[PDB]
């Protein structure tokens, strides 16, 4: 029984918790926009080959796999993270393709994980693209029995595209989602001008773009947020006033602010009416449907001023709501308040490293494969002598050594020759070896060209981003009103 000072214990135990929540729970990485749980989910989908072209996989299997190999926490944490990623009212660019009940804007939960099924969305392929081409550093998992990515290649700017919210210890984060076309345009601008200003970047990125559409009021909160990392953004419902017959009117709401629960908002209005804290409302209906989209109707009493009632609803209910921007992300493993340009700069630097590393990997592998095919070509060129050498050998070892001696072959080449099946000696097979070799030589010189010229490498980054923009870029949903 050794003594433990209470002060020492509190400081060390608390710091341990605090740091863990900061670097490995609640805050996203600047490079891929992900927290650990999300990263491990997508990695798990990748490692089990759960791509968009394959059938949906059972949620329970995905969850069980991720929990055992990568994420030593409760199954509810894992499943709920995966659910949100599949919700088109939560993610501006959904990362998971879900089948079955995945919850609603009314705060209904997903179905039990045994019922639902999931795979990657097409855009998630771009998060994971080239993960096996030594583009990112792998690390040991929590128990030393697996490997997991420290970060994803992230071939589109996911932190800003999908945003992030997280409560840590000593700090929190709140990053709004953005339009992917605007973001990539901004990256492209930055790639041509390291010294570009926030104001110029805002010529590409007008402001946040919520999956739920709606309105933002003014640009000054956006501008403060982009300049400093912090700012208040006023969001409004999309609401119109229209006639309903007999001289009567109604307010019709077709889009609601980001992260507002629709059913809760309605109950709040019902409450205000019931407690006579708002005048002029005669009916309240949620007419939302799959076929008609979001539609909330507020009937106004004949001859009441419907505009006055609407302004009251903005004052008194979540029909108007603020987004407090607080852009904290992990930069070089540390939490940091960042502005819009810093976010884009870290992202672009990650892309350069990914594409360079991918190029270097592709080159090593092409040269290895060219070496092997040079061995097979030698064997085909002298097949009779090859056969003789092997037949006169009592063991594989002796055959290997004799092949290396007689033909000046490496160990790898000799083993490739001994592993070659007799069917490889047909006319079409022989031609296939030659053709692959010729293609590889061209490929190798293409790769060397890239690594020889930084400008060519950078241009390749631009071109790949441009391709993603053209395939996945979409229209702005949220209207920014002056």
């Amino acid at each position: 029984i050794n003594e433990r000072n209470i002060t020492s214990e509190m400081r060390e135990s608390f710091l341990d918790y605090a740091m863990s929540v900061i670097v490995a729970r609640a805050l996203p990485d600047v490079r891929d926009g992900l927290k650990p749980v999300h990263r491990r989910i997508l990695y798990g989908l990748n490692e089990q080959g759960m791509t968009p072209d394959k059938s949906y996989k059972k949620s329970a299997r995905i969850v069980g796999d991720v929990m055992g190999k990568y994420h030593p926490h409760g199954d509810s944490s894992i499943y709920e993270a995966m659910v949100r990623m599949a919700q088109d009212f939560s993610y501006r660019y959904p990362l998971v393709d879900g089948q079955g009940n995945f919850g609603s804007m009314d705060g209904d939960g997903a179905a039990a994980m045994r019922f639902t099924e999931a795979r990657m969305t097409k855009i998630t392929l771009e998060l994971l693209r080239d993960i096996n081409k030594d583009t990112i550093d792998f690390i040991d998992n929590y128990d030393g029995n697996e490997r997991e990515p420290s970060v994803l290649p992230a071939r589109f700017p996911n932190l800003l595209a999908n945003g992030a919210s997280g409560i840590a210890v000593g700090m929190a984060t709140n990053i709004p989602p953005h339009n992917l076309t605007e973001l990539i345009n901004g990256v492209l601008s930055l790639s041509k001008n390291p010294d570009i200003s926030i104001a110029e970047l805002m010529e590409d990125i007008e402001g946040p773009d919520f999956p739920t559409a709606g309105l933002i009021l003014g640009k000054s909160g956006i501008r403060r947020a982009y300049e400093t990392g912090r700012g208040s953004i006023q969001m409004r419902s999309r609401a119109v006033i229209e006639e309903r017959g007999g001289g009567r009117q109604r307010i019709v709401v077709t889009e609601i602010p980001f992260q507002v629960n629709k059913a809760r908002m309605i109950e709040k209005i019902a409450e205000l009416v019931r407690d006579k804290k708002i005048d002029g409302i005669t009916d309240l209906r949620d007419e939302t449907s799959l076929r008609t989209g979001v539609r909330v109707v507020i009937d106004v009493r004949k001859d009441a001023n419907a505009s006055v009632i609407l302004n009251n609803l903005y004052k008194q209910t979540p029909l108007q709501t603020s987004f407090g921007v607080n852009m904290i992300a992990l930069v070089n493993g540390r939490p940091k308040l960042i502005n819009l340009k810093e976010a884009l700069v870290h992202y672009l630097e990650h892309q350069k490293t990914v594409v360079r590393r991918r190029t270097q990997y592709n080159l090593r592998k092409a040269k290895d494969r060219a070496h092997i095919l040079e061995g097979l070509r030698i064997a085909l060129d002298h097949i009779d002598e090859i056969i003789s050498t092997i037949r006169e050998s009592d063991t594989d070892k002796v055959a290997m050594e004799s092949l290396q001696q007689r033909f000046k072959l490496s160990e790898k080449q000799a083993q490739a020759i001994l592993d070659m099946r007799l069917r490889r000696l047909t006319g079409l097979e022989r031609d296939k070896i030659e053709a692959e070799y010729n293609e590889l030589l061209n490929y190798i010189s293409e790769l060397e060209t890239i690594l020889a010229d930084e400008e060519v490498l950078l241009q390749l980054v631009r071109d790949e981003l441009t391709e993603i923009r053209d395939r996945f870029g979409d229209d702005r949903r949220t209207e920014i009103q002056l």
Binding site: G100, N101, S104, D108, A110, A111, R114, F115, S289, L290
Partner: protein, 192 residues
């Protein structure tokens, strides 16, 4: 009921209530439905067998209460068809054998406590597609199109022909005497 997601119309003639197994099924059902004429009451799995339970237990059961409240007709002697809040009560259990069981349990309740509801032709059985463990496995649109959409759906309307035979059937299948149920199974089962 808190669980009851009611429809907007207040005209029983055109309103329908769907009974589903729980919130996994209820979620798809709520999203896919036509909320003007279609109400949803999610249950919670296997419901009380009223043929084996005494009245006190029946009237204390939450799911039974929610169904009585939602229907608005009262029960037994106090049943009043005119106070029906819906002219279609649609049983929509999952498409597995357990869904079938729940359907027998629901029909037992309607028969013993709300028989005029059946006589009036107000009780229906939905016909969701096979191959899904639960409705919560289906997308909302697929459940709407195949099962809830009046344009394409196929409902079975429950019909009572012979009340004496029905009495004996409920008693035999659902009652406390095991032996008759055992005899029924032996007489009717067609095995491997």
């Amino acid at each position: 009921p808190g669980k009851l997601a009611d429809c907007s119309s207040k005209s029983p003639e055109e309103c329908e209530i769907f009974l589903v197994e729980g919130d996994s099924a209820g979620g798809s059902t709520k999203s896919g439905r036509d909320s003007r004429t279609q109400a949803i009451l999610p249950l919670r799995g296997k419901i009380l067998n009223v043929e084996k339970a005494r009245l006190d237990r029946i009237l204390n059961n939450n799911e039974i209460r929610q169904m009585i409240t939602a229907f608005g007709t009262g029960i037994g002697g106090d049943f009043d068809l005119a106070k029906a809040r819906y002219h279609k009560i649609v049983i929509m259990t999952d498409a597995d054998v357990d869904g079938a069981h729940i359907r027998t349990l629901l029909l037992t309740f309607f028969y013993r406590f709300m028989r005029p509801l059946i006589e009036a032709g107000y009780v229906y059985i939905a016909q969701p597609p096979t191959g899904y463990k639960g409705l919560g496995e289906m997308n909302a649109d697929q459940l709407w199109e195949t099962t809830m959409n009046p344009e394409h759906r196929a409902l079975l309307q429950v019909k009572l022909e012979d009340a004496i035979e029905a009495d004996q059937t409920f008693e035999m299948l659902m009652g406390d005497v095991v032996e008759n149920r055992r005899q029924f199974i032996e007489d009717n089962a067609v095995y491997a």
